[PDB]
């Protein structure tokens, strides 16, 4: 269930297996001939961690369907076999199968959340052959959802070759996305840590009480520099600090927490912060917040979706340069390292599950007996709800302690106004609120066409998150008519007395295209688009956030509607600014983190 | 009916009125208040000749609906009022209304063909106020055809503001497109000239007999330098030359023809050339030709569709640099000056009418009583056939003598496989063959989806001209499956034993986008697309021409499918080459004008 | 002296400390206040490994002068304190100072070669504060060499702010460039391994004898799959294999070598390959080789010079796509991981030292008493020779075993035709040949202006490596006059009877700029430039290699001559191909690895 971020400590090791592994594409006789038994023959090379799709040439490699085989030898000295040996795969996209010496030790479904296995038993001495098989197939049983044709459906479709058809607007990057590490710990070890914060704003000098639980199978506090200030015994626990330095947006502070438990020990950074909804206002530390930022992607060249800590730091630098304060993990949980970095740098995050494409109205829509099948058809619709809960389980269990995480997003653009939607999401929202020890807000990001009266989010969600494209897909290029439509729908959303924020809005823009009299796809049109939208946003005291789509240009599946990927970014794929980036920087510079329009 | 190209001669003048005129947009009280009576107030400035759409700023100006008013004063001395004064408007797009001193002297429908009026009667002495009103409205009665919504129909459509919606894929550039000149001539004057060529290939030294007619309301021959070689009297006439220098593709020769007729005289360049179809082979001068070139547009910045002789010469230079030999006047007759230039430089031309958009299946298709209305519905379909004939009349009457003109194109992508198509085009083809004194081939350019069995062009046309996009709109990005489909349809077209040529095929390509593993919209994909198509072309001895679409990027109406216009050009809008331009140059360099695959 | 690549084995661990460390810029009171003692206050964040220059915003950060402070806590359990604890800094650019708990444990000069220190003594238990201070200052004592003004010297120079002025044409990326890892090993351990190959081509089935030495402070062989085939005892040693699979260019093979030595063990991949010079011919495995490739940079966004294994694999993929076979480590030794990858993928490498900028004629040239100071002036010239030898020592000691390494490059563009040049390089070449157990060729890359009679490389070097820009800096834009000059100088180089190869030649090209009639900086001009140069290369049987400059666009110091960096790449900085990339791919496809022109 629970997984702490591995890190070197007094009692645990940490051996990063990152490097160039052996690699081979399934053909698809890989399992018949038991390639996991022996070392791979005719193997190519492949770095880890990284999506493999862009690291070789040819459409057959990039658009490969099925399995790939990673392989690498490992070896451990016996003088720590006394300890337990565990293998943490930070992420394998999508479906992983971990062999060792030819024996299937582990399986996992879920391309964006960590999972571990124990190695003490099957780790013979000498050099041991580790093989990881990675599958990329997506369908009605996976999150994200795979369709039956192109999402934008002219086009293709006449081919019998088996192919993935994403029901989502990003490229199906697969492989060992995130680091594969080996760490140790003593039999009887700290397995999970939880920390909540009851805090007091009555006083001019805010105090805070920190409850904690340390599941296991001394607790020291430290502040930034490491000046110790408190101590307690047992899995039991509480701290009383006065003169709390509140973790703030763009003004972070992380106390340290040292938990020694006999033969084992682990340190956890924690930020003291409060967040709660109050009618219109979205309060962080009992102050009226306003989101400024974007929906992002873990998308870089040529790593694909592979983790890129240099870019993560560069993205933060650009955000603080642009006077942003937040972003959403579109459309999947990001790496642990990026989440911890957001703690250090003080960026508000909207952590989202992998639940994109739970909407069978995209594309032409799948068909059965002539009839079109609704999204939540129990026999021919999505088969994802049970896996959907495991994702909510594993996600909250991983990022429960992050001060940056401010709200959970159950799904991106699901068919939330259709038959079966409420019964699908009600158990998910309930599980979301039951397992989050901090009871933070929950939402879902609403596709276009949704209204206040028809959205199951109008009831289940604490915050309304809209993806609206008035002036692009709907109204472009007449920004005046689009303005009227945006004001009309947005007014209707004020009926709920709930906070509203736009998590996505943008216009495809090819860096370099200009005109004094703007047309679609030019940098001028992009600025005018955001001008019109932001003008309507500023009219409604109940909109509490603007998040542009996207932060940067990113790769998608090929289609007539995608000009070498999605070009809605404020920055290019190599993080160079378009003209709209300087527009938002000037606008966001005058809008404060708190009390924008109260 | 007939209109000769005005040019300075011994008996006629030529006063180009080109310059900066007064200009004003209708609002739309222009005719109520009789703005044509007085000089215009609050007028802006506008050069002539030029499309006005891109010469000012603001969407309201560029997307203006309705009328505009040009105005300019003229004056003539009396010492040539003895002569007749005629005003030749080379082209006014679309509908022109010529006032003078407040009196409506002329009207014209047809935005791409010349028309004149006589000035002797209403030309008082002193300074006379000339006003031209230009209308841009397009609908089911105009050629090109105006629709009811965007041609690519997400989008727009919710606006009540009256707007043009082109049923064609280029921008509705309007205004005084081509020069407005004043020339003289004596009462009793040469009105029309016609020259045919019966020529003899029996001998090792080809001789030629030139019949001519000189309609009127001495005939001298001259060769290139001006060395005279023959003479004849009367409207009657014939010439017998031996050692003819045959006008060839990329090797032109223009004899001169001086026709003195009493008080009047006119000189006409003429090239001696033969063209006839023979089963598979397209013969020019009894040799098997092969078209190499493009579909072009009269499209430059910022002239819009306005005439641009510097670019016309530059385009020819680029064609001869690229080893091309031909192009089509997509999708309207081009300027006279460009046609005469093609005579001098020796470029084969496929002269096409303004009949684009005669196809109501584009867009969503217009609706009536729930029913969709077919293209040639007699009550709710196109109302263009009678105007369509006037266009065929005026066009052939203008370019009957050009040696470069090798074939006529009745329409671009009409609904030629629908009910009513044959009865619509049969009288048009008949008029085309009846009025062309040289009886040159006639065709229509067939939309995609057309087959040999279903196309009314399979019967009416001497040459089959296809617009196929296997590997772009149909099959992209799988070029292998697209190849199979292209070979399958092309084989079926060989059933007719007629010549086949592709007048359009291409892929949108944004100059600058590259990848080693190509995706759509990159320069690499564009090259691979043309490689696949050209490979299939070379397999069939009955394909006699490849014409890429387009020659250069050009402006279109705004839509999600158009990245700042149509990007299918081999060159950018400013005539800079994409990578595919060097590919075609290398391919066309090894393919000869004659006897490519015989 | 000797350093083996750390990797997990039966007896050693490997704990990658890569991650987000604490970071702070010196101001420059860092050492006065002993920031290394305590944890850093007001610290920012910084990932490791990566150059820090592009990971924050502002010119002051990017152009920082002096020191920066990395900091991170580490902890080790006692149950392996029995082993020795060593800290391998793969590279710290330029000058590193490693504190721990406040004590200076190590120092290092050399920004591109590894160095380690032992941790057993100063590693108290608990959490231990590790601090690394990095300096970026460059001058006449460092390799690469720092100047006194801009290398291209209009410009700047009027500022008193202390600044680095690279005497080289790449950006002064600094910080922890390459991974910082911790590995273990038993007291008494394998410290160094050396393997040579005496091999026999007499027989139709080539056999090979492998001598080896295992310095220390059982030996098993294995072949690709791991099928064992031989064994020997002692530091003593030899192997006799028959049916050797020769490591070939673009056809690699790596036998494995397992050396168990009591309590310790290490595995080394080795490729059996021969290389020797023979008059004109450059022989690899007794066959006449021909280099096809580029000079590269370890340069990516935003890592700067930081190691990027995803890009390294992508670069190899592009090379094999382009039909290249080799590259040079311009202008510094690359990462170990890239060298091992070249072993696996079979790319020929020209390993080069950090000796760039040993040439004081660049810029305006430094001045003293009015006099200009020559490069090797003993009082005011370069002070680098002794450090220069340590670089040759550490480099060969690291890459002595790589089969890909085929030739050593002592320096890039030194003032090799000046007074003092011979006495400067003679001891360096001697040290190069003395310490390389395989006695592979040695060279230096000759600046433009050098001739056969004036170059000290004409004598000291086994291969002549030229950097010539006929048609760019010299002759551009007249490629005809430039051709004459290139043929004239190249003919004169044939006087030596030695092999000649061009290690650099190119023309700055901004991706997107085109013209049918080419001008400098367009993609067309770049192709024509390489066409002219390659035409002259093919005329001389003694030129054995063409290596273009550069592989990809890369960052440089700002100057009027650098359009956002060096644009001479065949690919863009994000590895997208320019038109010249497809030219070289077509040319290199017809040129074989061996026997091109014999
Ligand atoms: O069309 C777009 O650009 C985007 O539209 C939104 O609905 C999706 O959230 C996003 O994944 C797409 O990339
Ligand atoms: O889609 C395209 O690029 C083109 O398709 C063809 O059918 C039309 O002839 C042309 O007008 C369009 O511009
Ligand atoms: O001028 C250039 O582009 C290059 O010239 C060469 O002499 C240098 O080796 C290289 O560092 C420069 O980048």
CSV table of C-alpha atoms in Angstrom, one decimal, chain A residues 56-60 62 152 154-156 158-161 301 472-478 480-481 508 510 512-522 525 558-565 567, chain B residues 56-60 62 152 154-156 158-161 301 472-478 480-481 508 510 512-522 525 558-565 567:
chain,number,residue,atom,x,y,z
A,56,UNK,CA,16.0,5.0,-32.1
A,57,UNK,CA,15.0,5.7,-35.7
A,58,UNK,CA,12.2,4.4,-37.9
A,59,UNK,CA,8.4,4.4,-37.6
A,60,UNK,CA,8.4,0.7,-36.7
A,62,UNK,CA,8.6,4.5,-32.5
A,152,UNK,CA,-9.4,13.4,-33.5
A,154,UNK,CA,-10.2,11.6,-43.4
A,155,UNK,CA,-7.3,10.2,-41.5
A,156,UNK,CA,-6.1,6.5,-41.4
A,158,UNK,CA,-7.6,1.0,-43.1
A,159,UNK,CA,-4.6,-0.9,-41.6
A,160,UNK,CA,-4.8,-4.3,-40.1
A,161,UNK,CA,-1.5,-4.0,-38.3
A,301,UNK,CA,13.3,15.6,-25.9
A,472,UNK,CA,-10.2,28.1,-30.4
A,473,UNK,CA,-12.1,24.9,-31.0
A,474,UNK,CA,-15.4,26.8,-30.2
A,475,UNK,CA,-15.7,30.2,-31.9
A,476,UNK,CA,-12.3,30.7,-33.5
A,477,UNK,CA,-11.5,32.9,-35.1
A,478,UNK,CA,-14.3,35.3,-33.9
A,480,UNK,CA,-16.2,38.5,-29.9
A,481,UNK,CA,-18.8,35.8,-30.3
A,508,UNK,CA,-2.2,26.2,-30.9
A,510,UNK,CA,3.6,27.8,-34.0
A,512,UNK,CA,7.6,32.2,-35.6
A,513,UNK,CA,4.2,32.8,-37.2
A,514,UNK,CA,3.2,36.5,-36.8
A,515,UNK,CA,0.8,39.0,-38.3
A,516,UNK,CA,-0.2,42.6,-37.4
A,517,UNK,CA,-3.7,41.5,-38.3
A,518,UNK,CA,-3.7,38.2,-36.5
A,519,UNK,CA,-5.0,34.9,-37.7
A,520,UNK,CA,-5.2,31.5,-36.0
A,521,UNK,CA,-1.9,29.8,-35.2
A,522,UNK,CA,0.1,33.1,-34.9
A,525,UNK,CA,-3.8,35.4,-32.0
A,558,UNK,CA,0.1,12.0,-35.6
A,559,UNK,CA,-3.1,13.7,-37.0
A,560,UNK,CA,-4.1,16.5,-39.3
A,561,UNK,CA,-5.0,18.6,-36.2
A,562,UNK,CA,-1.6,18.3,-34.6
A,563,UNK,CA,1.3,20.3,-36.1
A,564,UNK,CA,4.2,18.1,-35.0
A,565,UNK,CA,2.5,17.7,-31.6
A,567,UNK,CA,1.4,23.6,-30.0
B,56,UNK,CA,-5.0,47.8,-44.0
B,57,UNK,CA,-5.2,46.5,-40.5
B,58,UNK,CA,-8.0,45.0,-38.5
B,59,UNK,CA,-10.3,42.0,-39.0
B,60,UNK,CA,-13.2,44.2,-39.9
B,62,UNK,CA,-9.8,42.2,-44.0
B,152,UNK,CA,-13.6,22.4,-43.7
B,154,UNK,CA,-16.0,22.7,-33.9
B,155,UNK,CA,-15.3,25.9,-35.7
B,156,UNK,CA,-17.5,29.0,-35.8
B,158,UNK,CA,-22.8,31.1,-34.3
B,159,UNK,CA,-22.5,34.7,-35.7
B,160,UNK,CA,-25.3,36.7,-37.3
B,161,UNK,CA,-22.9,39.1,-39.0
B,301,UNK,CA,2.1,39.5,-50.1
B,472,UNK,CA,-2.2,13.0,-46.4
B,473,UNK,CA,-6.0,13.4,-46.0
B,474,UNK,CA,-6.4,9.7,-46.9
B,475,UNK,CA,-4.0,7.4,-45.2
B,476,UNK,CA,-1.6,9.8,-43.4
B,477,UNK,CA,0.6,9.0,-41.7
B,478,UNK,CA,0.9,5.4,-43.0
B,480,UNK,CA,2.5,2.1,-47.0
B,481,UNK,CA,-1.3,1.6,-46.8
B,508,UNK,CA,1.0,20.6,-45.6
B,510,UNK,CA,5.7,24.2,-42.2
B,512,UNK,CA,11.5,24.7,-40.3
B,513,UNK,CA,9.9,21.5,-38.9
B,514,UNK,CA,12.2,18.5,-39.2
B,515,UNK,CA,12.7,15.1,-37.8
B,516,UNK,CA,15.0,12.2,-38.6
B,517,UNK,CA,12.0,9.9,-37.9
B,518,UNK,CA,9.5,12.0,-39.9
B,519,UNK,CA,6.0,13.0,-38.7
B,520,UNK,CA,3.2,14.9,-40.6
B,521,UNK,CA,3.9,18.6,-41.3
B,522,UNK,CA,7.7,18.2,-41.3
B,525,UNK,CA,7.4,13.7,-44.4
B,558,UNK,CA,-9.1,30.8,-41.2
B,559,UNK,CA,-9.8,27.3,-39.9
B,560,UNK,CA,-8.2,24.7,-37.6
B,561,UNK,CA,-7.0,22.8,-40.6
B,562,UNK,CA,-5.0,25.8,-42.1
B,563,UNK,CA,-1.8,26.8,-40.4
B,564,UNK,CA,-1.7,30.4,-41.5
B,565,UNK,CA,-2.9,29.4,-44.9
B,567,UNK,CA,1.2,25.0,-46.4
